[PDB]
C-alpha cells in the first residue's frame, strides 16, 4: 500500500508514538527537512510542518495512518509513482500560487 | 516480511486462477456429459 | 477475575534475554515467575489483512474479556456457589491457569480455524459471539429464579397480615383479632392460633362484626380458603426448587461458562500476542513468549529483561 502524506517536523514525536505497532518495524518515513515554515493548506500564515512519506501495509493500518496524517494538519500533497510528475506538480502549484 | 506478504497475494491470485481452472474442468466433465447426452439423444433418435 | 497479564513478547526477543530463557531458567523466573507459554504456529503465514483486523479488533476484544469478566463475576456473586471454582477447577485449556498458558493445544482447529491469522481473528469472533449467548443464558435464569423465589415464601407465616390461612382455624371468618353476649351462640372459640379468637356465631352477623373488626382488635387479612395456603407452600416449594437450580446447577454451568470465556480470553490473548510478534519480528507464526501473575516488583523486573524490545 501507499502510505503517502506529510508528518509535522514539530509533531514528529507524537507521529513516532501514535501508531507505533502500525509502522512494524519495516516502515520508515522520510521526513522533510522543514527547515523553512511550510505553507499550510488552510493557514496562510505557515507553520513548522514537515512531509514525511510511510510504507503501508494492512487496511486497518493503512486506514489509521490515513487520519493521523489528516489529523497532523502538516502540509501534504498526494506522491505521484515517478518523482518526475511530482516535480512537475510542485512546480505548477508555486507558479499558481 | 512485506516481500513474503507480496508474494501471499500473488499465491493467493494464483490460487485462484488455479481453482477456477478446477473448475473449468468440472464444468468441461459436465458439458461434455451432457454433449454425450445429446449425442445419445439425436443418436437414437437416428 | 484476573485481567490480561501476558507481556507482548515476540519470537526473536522473548520474555527473558533469551528467547528459549522464556521457557525455563528466565530472569524473571529469578524473581520466582511461572512466566511459561508457548504459540501452535498457524497453517499458513498470515496476510497483513491479518494484522490489519487484528489492530481494528483489539477495542473490540478488549470489550469481549470486560463482558467476560463482569458476567462471571456476576454469577458467582449472584448465586453464591459459582465461586467455587479454581485456576485447576476451570481446566482452561485442560489444566490450571499457569499451566494453561502454558498449553498451546488449544489452538488447533477445534475452537480456532488453525487457518491463516485472517481466519483465526473472525473465529475468536465467533467464539466471543457464541460466549455471550452464556451471558444471555445466565441473565435469563437469574431473572426467571428472582421472579420464583420472590412470588412465594415471601408472606407471612399466618394470623398476620398475609398469608394467614395456613394458620386458619380450619359461621366463622378468617379474622384473627389480635390486640360478644347475643341470642347467638357465641359460647365457641375458633382454633385460629398462631392471634387470638373471640367469642362469634354465625347466627347473628353483629356479633361476628363485634368480634372480628367493630371496635378494638381489627381482623386480620387471609388468603380466601386454606387451600390457597396450601398452593402457597407449594409454588413456595417450587420457587426454593428453582432458587436452588439457579445457585447450584445454574452456578455449575456459570463456573462452566466461566472456564470457557477463560480459555477464550486465553486464545485471544494468544492471538494478539501472535499479532503484536509478527509486527515486531517476521511475519509467519512464530511465538516464544510467556504469561504469568506476578507483583508489581515482578512486573518491572520483566521490563528489565525486555527492554530490549519494549513497545
Given at each position: 500500500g501507499f502510505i503517502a502524506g506529510l508528518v509535522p517536523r514539530e509533531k514528529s514525536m507524537s507521529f513516532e508514538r501514535m501508531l507505533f505497532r502500525a509502522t512494524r518495524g519495516n516502515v520508515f518515513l522520510r521526513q522533510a527537512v522543514v527547515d523553512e515554515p511550510v505553507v499550510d493548506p488552510v493557514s496562510?500564515?505557515?507553520?513548522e510542518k514537515n512531509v514525511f512519506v510511510v510504507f503501508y501495509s494492512g487496511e486497518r493500518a493503512k486506514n489509521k495512518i490515513l487520519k493521523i496524517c489528516d489529523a497532523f494538519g502538516a502540509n501534504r500533497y498526494p506522491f505521484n509513482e515517478e518523482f518526475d510528475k511530482q516535480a512537475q506538480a510542485i512546480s505548477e502549484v508555486s507558479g499558481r500560487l | 516480511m512485506v516481500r513474503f506478504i507480496r508474494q501471499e497475494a500473488e499465491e493467493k491470485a494464483n490460487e485462484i486462477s488455479v481453482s477456477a481452472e478446477e473448475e473449468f474442468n468440472i464444468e468441461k466433465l459436465q458439458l461434455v456429459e451432457a454433449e454425450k447426452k445429446k449425442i445419445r439423444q439425436e443418436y437414437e433418435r437416428k | 477475575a484476573s485481567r490480561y497479564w501476558v507481556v507482548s513478547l515476540p519470537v526473536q526477543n522473548?520474555?527473558?534475554?533469551v528467547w528459549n530463557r522464556l521457557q525455563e531458567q528466565i530472569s524473571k523466573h529469578s524473581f520466582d515467575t511461572p512466566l511459561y507459554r508457548f504459540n501452535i504456529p498457524n497453517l499458513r503465514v498470515g496476510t497483513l489483512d491479518s494484522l490489519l483486523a487484528l489492530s481494528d479488533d483489539l477495542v473490540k476484544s478488549n470489550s469481549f474479556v470486560e463482558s467476560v469478566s463482569h458476567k462471571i463475576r456476576r454469577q458467582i456473586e449472584e448465586?453464591?456457589?459459582?465461586?467455587?471454582?479454581?485456576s485447576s477447577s476451570l481446566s482452561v485449556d485442560g489444566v490450571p491457569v499457569d499451566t494453561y498458558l502454558t498449553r498451546?493445544?488449544?489452538?488447533?482447529?477445534?475452537?480456532?480455524?488453525?487457518?491463516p491469522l485472517r481466519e483465526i481473528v473472525d473465529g475468536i469472533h465467533t467464539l466471543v459471539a457464541k460466549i455471550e449467548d452464556d451471558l444471555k443464558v445466565r441473565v435469563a435464569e437469574y431473572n426467571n429464579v428472582r421472579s420464583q423465589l420472590n412470588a412465594?415464601?415471601?408472606?407471612?407465616?399466618?394470623?398476620?397480615?398475609?398469608?394467614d390461612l395456613s394458620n386458619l382455624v380450619k359461621?366463622?371468618?378468617?379474622?384473627?383479632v389480635v390486640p360478644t353476649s347475643y341470642?347467638?351462640?357465641?359460647?365457641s372459640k375458633l382454633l385460629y392460633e398462631d392471634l387470638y379468637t373471640v367469642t362469634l356465631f354465625g347466627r347473628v352477623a353483629d356479633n361476628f362484626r363485634i368480634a372480628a373488626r367493630e371496635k378494638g382488635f381489627q381482623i386480620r387479612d387471609f388468603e380466601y380458603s386454606s387451600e390457597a395456603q396450601e398452593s402457597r407452600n407449594q409454588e413456595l416449594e417450587k420457587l426454593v426448587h428453582d432458587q436452588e437450580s439457579l445457585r447450584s446447577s445454574l452456578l455449575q454451568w456459570c463456573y462452566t461458562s466461566y472456564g470457557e470465556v477463560f480459555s477464550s480470553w486465553m486464545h485471544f490473548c494468544a492471538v494478539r500476542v501472535f499479532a503484536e510478534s509478527i509486527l515486531?519480528?517476521?511475519?509467519?507464526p512464530s511465538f516464544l513468549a510467556c504469561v504469568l501473575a506476578p507483583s508489581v516488583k515482578g512486573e518491572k523486573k520483566v521490563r528489565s529483561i525486555l527492554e530490549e524490545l519494549c513497545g
Open positions: 496562510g500564515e505557515k507553520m | - | 522473548s520474555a527473558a534475554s448465586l453464591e456457589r459459582v465461586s467455587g471454582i479454581e498451546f493445544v488449544w489452538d488447533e482447529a477445534k475452537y480456532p480455524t488453525m487457518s412465594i415464601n415471601r408472606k407471612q407465616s399466618g394470623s398476620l397480615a398475609v398469608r359461621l366463622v371468618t378468617l379474622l384473627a341470642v347467638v351462640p357465641r359460647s515486531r519480528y517476521g511475519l509467519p
